[PDB]
Amino acid sequence: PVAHLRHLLRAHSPLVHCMTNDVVQTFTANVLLAVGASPAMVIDPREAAQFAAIADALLINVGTLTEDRAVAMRAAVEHARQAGKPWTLDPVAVGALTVRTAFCHELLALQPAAIRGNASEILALAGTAAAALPAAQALARRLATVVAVTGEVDYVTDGERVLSVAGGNPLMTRVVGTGCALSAVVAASAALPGDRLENVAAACGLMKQAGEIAARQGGPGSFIPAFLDALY
Amino acid sequence: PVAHLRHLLRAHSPLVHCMTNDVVQTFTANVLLAVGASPAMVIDPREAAQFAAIADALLINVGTLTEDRAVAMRAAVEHARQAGKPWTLDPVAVGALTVRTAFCHELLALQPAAIRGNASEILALAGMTAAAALPAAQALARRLATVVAVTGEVDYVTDGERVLSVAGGNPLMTRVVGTGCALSAVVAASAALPGDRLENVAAACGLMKQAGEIAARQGGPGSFIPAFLDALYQE
Amino acid sequence: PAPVAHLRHLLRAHSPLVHCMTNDVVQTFTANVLLAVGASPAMVIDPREAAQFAAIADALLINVGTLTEDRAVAMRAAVEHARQAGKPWTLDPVAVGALTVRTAFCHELLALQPAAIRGNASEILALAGMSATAAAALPAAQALARRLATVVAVTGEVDYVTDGERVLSVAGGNPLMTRVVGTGCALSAVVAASAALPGDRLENVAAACGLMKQAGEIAARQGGPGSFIPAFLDALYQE
Ligand SMILES: Cc1ncsc1CCO
Ligand SMILES: Cc1ncsc1CCO
Ligand SMILES: Cc1ncsc1CCO
Ligand SMILES: [Mg+2]
Ligand SMILES: [Mg+2]
Ligand SMILES: [Mg+2]
Numbered sequence A: 001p002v003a004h005l006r007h008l009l010r011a012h013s014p015l016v017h018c019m020t021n022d023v024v025q026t027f028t029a030n031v032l033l034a035v036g037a038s039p040a041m042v043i044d045p046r047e048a049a050q051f052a053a054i055a056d057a058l059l060i061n062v063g064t065l066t067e068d069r070a071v072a073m074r075a076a077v078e079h080a081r082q083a084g085k086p087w088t089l090d091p092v093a094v095g096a097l098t099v100r101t102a103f104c105h106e107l108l109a110l111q112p113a114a115i116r117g118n119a120s121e122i123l124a125l126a127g128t129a130a131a132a133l134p135a136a137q138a139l140a141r142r143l144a145t146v147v148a149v150t151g152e153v154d155y156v157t158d159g160e161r162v163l164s165v166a167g168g169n170p171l172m173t174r175v176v177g178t179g180c181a182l183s184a185v186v187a188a189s190a191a192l193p194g195d196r197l198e199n200v201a202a203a204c205g206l207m208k209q210a211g212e213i214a215a216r217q218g219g220p221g222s223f224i225p226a227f228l229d230a231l232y
Numbered sequence B: 001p002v003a004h005l006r007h008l009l010r011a012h013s014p015l016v017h018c019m020t021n022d023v024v025q026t027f028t029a030n031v032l033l034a035v036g037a038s039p040a041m042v043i044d045p046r047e048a049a050q051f052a053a054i055a056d057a058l059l060i061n062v063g064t065l066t067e068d069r070a071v072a073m074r075a076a077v078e079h080a081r082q083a084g085k086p087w088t089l090d091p092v093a094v095g096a097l098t099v100r101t102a103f104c105h106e107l108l109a110l111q112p113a114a115i116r117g118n119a120s121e122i123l124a125l126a127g128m129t130a131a132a133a134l135p136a137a138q139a140l141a142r143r144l145a146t147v148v149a150v151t152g153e154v155d156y157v158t159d160g161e162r163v164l165s166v167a168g169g170n171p172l173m174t175r176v177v178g179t180g181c182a183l184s185a186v187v188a189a190s191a192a193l194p195g196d197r198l199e200n201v202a203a204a205c206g207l208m209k210q211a212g213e214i215a216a217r218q219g220g221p222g223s224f225i226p227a228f229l230d231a232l233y234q235e
Numbered sequence C: 001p002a003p004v005a006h007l008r009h010l011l012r013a014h015s016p017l018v019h020c021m022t023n024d025v026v027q028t029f030t031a032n033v034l035l036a037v038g039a040s041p042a043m044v045i046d047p048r049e050a051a052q053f054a055a056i057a058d059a060l061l062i063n064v065g066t067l068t069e070d071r072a073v074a075m076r077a078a079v080e081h082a083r084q085a086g087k088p089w090t091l092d093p094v095a096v097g098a099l100t101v102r103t104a105f106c107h108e109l110l111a112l113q114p115a116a117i118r119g120n121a122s123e124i125l126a127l128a129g130m131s132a133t134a135a136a137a138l139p140a141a142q143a144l145a146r147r148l149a150t151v152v153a154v155t156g157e158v159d160y161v162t163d164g165e166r167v168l169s170v171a172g173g174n175p176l177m178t179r180v181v182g183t184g185c186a187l188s189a190v191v192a193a194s195a196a197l198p199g200d201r202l203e204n205v206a207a208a209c210g211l212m213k214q215a216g217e218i219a220a221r222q223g224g225p226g227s228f229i230p231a232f233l234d235a236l237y238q239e
Helices: A002-012 A025-034 A045-052 A067-082 A098-110 A119-126 A129-143 A170-174 A178-189 A196-217 A220-231 B002-012 B025-034 B045-052 B067-083 B098-108 B119-126 B130-144 B171-175 B179-190 B197-216 B221-232 C002-014 C027-036 C047-056 C069-084 C100-110 C121-128 C135-148 C175-179 C183-194 C201-219 C225-237
Strands: A015-019 A038-040 A057-061 A087-090 A114-117 A146-149 A154-157 A162-165 B015-019 B038-040 B057-061 B087-090 B114-117 B147-150 B155-158 B163-166 C017-021 C040-042 C059-063 C089-092 C116-120 C151-155 C158-162 C167-171
Touching (some): A002 A178, A015 A045, A015 A067, A015 A178, A025 A178, A025 C027, A025 C225, A045 C100, A057 A178, A067 A087, A098 A119, A114 A196, A129 A146, A146 A196, A162 A196, A170 A220, A178 A196, A220 B025, A220 B221, B002 B179, B015 B025, B015 B179, B025 B221, B025 C027, B057 B179, B087 B098, B087 B179, B098 B119, B098 C047, B114 B197, B119 B130, B130 B147, B130 B155, B155 B197, B163 B197, B171 B197, B171 B221, B179 B197, B197 B221, C002 C183, C002 C201, C017 C027, C017 C047, C017 C183, C027 C183, C059 C183, C069 C100, C100 C121, C116 C121, C121 C151, C135 C158, C175 C201, C183 C201
Parallel strands (some): A057 A087, A087 A114, B114 B147
Antiparallel strands (some): A146 A154, A154 A162, B155 B163
C-alpha cells in the first residue's frame, strides 16, 4: 500500500504545480524529487494560469500568503479546475490569521480534491485530532473531497470512511515543512489511479515511514538528509 | 548561562514572528525549532500587524528588502510595540545599500529591544572588527535604551555601559549562509525570556558559537549544517 | 581537467562578489554553493538597491525560475546598471519555451548583451528560436553565441559550451544531480562568477561546468539525494 504508492509515484512521475510558502519551497521540491515526481514552482498570475492547466496536480499552501500571490493562486485553481486537474489545499494557520482564513473559505467553492491540515486548521475551515474528526467528515461531505487531519496520528476521511495512520516520530515536528511537504505528496497522489482516500492515507504512511527511519540519528539536522534519502 | 538560556528557550517556547530575508528563511525556522522555540513567517501587512501582537517576539531582517515588505515590516513593528512584544533588528548591509539604510534609520524610532549586526552596520546606524564598532554600539545602545550585539570573530554585547564579549565559534560559520541571521532570531527569542536582557543576548551569542564550534568539527560547510542543528537540539 | 583545477584556485583567490537575482527555490543552495567555492553571494532585489548593487558587484546572475512582474522590473534595472558599469551578467532562462511570460522577458533581455547564457537543450533551443541530451541544441547555442557575442552553455548529462565558433564539451557527473533541486541553478551562479575571472571566458565557463560535475560525482556516492547536498558542498569546499 505504501509500497504501491511509492512504485506509482515513480512510474507516473506526476508534474506538480507547487504554490507554497516561502519557508518550505526547497524542501517541498526535494521531497517531490526524491519520491520520483516533478516539482514546479510557478507564481506569476499568467504563467500560473497557463501552467496549472498543464500540470498533473496543483498544490495551494497559504503559509506566507500575500495579496499578489493570492491573485495568482486563485487563477491557478480556476485553470486547474477547468482542465480537470486535481488541486490540494493546505490551510496553514487558518483560524489564527484573518486574511488567510477569508481566502481559504473563498477557495473551498472551487472544489479541492483534497485538504491537508492540522486539527485547528480543519476545525477553522469547517466553522486535538479527535475534536477535528467531526469537522473533517462534515467538510468531506459538503465538498466531496478527501480531508486529512494530520498529527501524531493522521486521520483521513471521505466523509463516510475514516482511516488512521500511526507511526513516524515526534522529531518530525522539530523540522519545518514536513507537513507542507506531506501536502505536496498528497497533491501528487491525487493525480494517481486508485481510491483517492486510500492514496492519501498511503501518502501519510509514506511520510511517516520515511520519518521513523530519518529520526533514528536522533537530531533534526541529520533528520533532513536521512529523510530525503529514505524517500528515494 | 548558556545552559540556562537553553533551558529557558525550551521551557518558555517563545513564538517568534520572523520577517527575514529570502536566503535564510528555512534555516532560521529550523534553528528556532531546534532550540525549542516556534517560528512563524507572516508577511502580508494585515496578517503581520495581526500576528505581531500575538507572538512573543518579532524579528526584522532587511537582507532582501522590498517596498511591499518594508510596509509590512513597519506595520508589524508598530503593532508589536503597541502590544508590548520585543522586536529585534538585523540591519543586513545597512550602510552599503541606500534603501534599507534609510528604512532602518526610520525604524530605530520604534525602539527595538535588540539590534544584532556587524561592525559596519552598527556604525551606520549609530551615526558614527566588532571592537572598533564598540564605542558606536555603546552610543546606539544608550540613545535607544536597547541592547546592541556587534558580531564577528568575537561578539560584543552592550546596553550602553556594560560590555560583555563572547568568543568561540569557528571561521567555517562564515562559509555557511544565514548563521548570523539565525543568531538574530535566537537573540529575538531571548529578549522575550525572563532575566537580564543583556546577559540573555550574550548567552544567545555563546549558544550559537558553541554549536558552531561543534559543527565545524565535521570539516566542511555542507556537513556543518546538519551538525549545527543537531548541536542546538536536546534529547 | 587542468582549467577546472585552475578555476577552483582562481575562484578562491578572487572571491568574486556575485549579485544573485535567482528563483525562490534555490536561494539558499545558490548562496551556499557560491560560499563553498570561495565566492561571495549577495541577493538584492529591490529595484533601486539592485541598480546600485549591480554596479558594485563583480558579476550579475539573472535566473527567471520563479519570475514575477515586480522582480522582472528589478532584474531589468540590475542588468542595465551592470552593463553601464562593465560587469558581466549571466542569463539562466529557466523553463523558457514552456512558459510564455518569461520567454518574452528573456527575449527582451538578450538585447542587453549577457556575457553568458546557460540553459538545458529545450531552453536554449527556445531562446535561440530553433525547433527540434544537450547535443541537439548545439546548433542553437552556436547560433545564439554568434548573434550576441556571448558564451552559451547547454547542459545535460554532457555539457557543451560555445562562443559561436569554438565548442568545448564536458562529461561526467551523475544523474542523481537531477533528483536534487537547484544544481543547474547553482551551476549558473558559478558560471556567473567565472565570467568575472581573468583568462579565456569560454574556457572558464566550461571549467565551471567541470567543477560542478566533479563535485557531483563525489557527492553522488552518498547514494541518496538527501546525503548528496552536504557532500556536494563539502566537495566544493575541499582543498
Ligand atoms: C514557520 C512558517 N511560517 C509560515 S509557514 C511556515 C512553515 C510551516 O508551514
Ligand atoms: C547572501 C544574502 N543577500 C541578502 S541577505 C543574505 C543572507 C546573509 O545575511
Ligand atoms: C522547481 C523549480 N520551479 C521554478 S524554478 C525551479 C528550480 C529548479 O531547479
Ligand atoms: Mg497545515
Ligand atoms: Mg547583519
Ligand atoms: Mg535552466
